[PDB]
Amino acid sequence: RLAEPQLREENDLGLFGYWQTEEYQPPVAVDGKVPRNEFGNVYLFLPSMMPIGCVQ
DSSP, rough: OSSSSSGSSSOOOOOOOOOOOOOOOOOOBBBOOOOTTTTTTOOOOGGGSSSSSSOO
């Protein structure tokens, strides 16, 4: 928004309701590789989000 003033008032954040979301499914490591997000990391806000077969 600072770089482009036209986007200052643009609503670029999307909000989803409860009915639009399903239960989270833990990932499973493949070929001994830890699953990664789009940034190449793993989100571990909760222990249930830990990949199956992986230990912290």
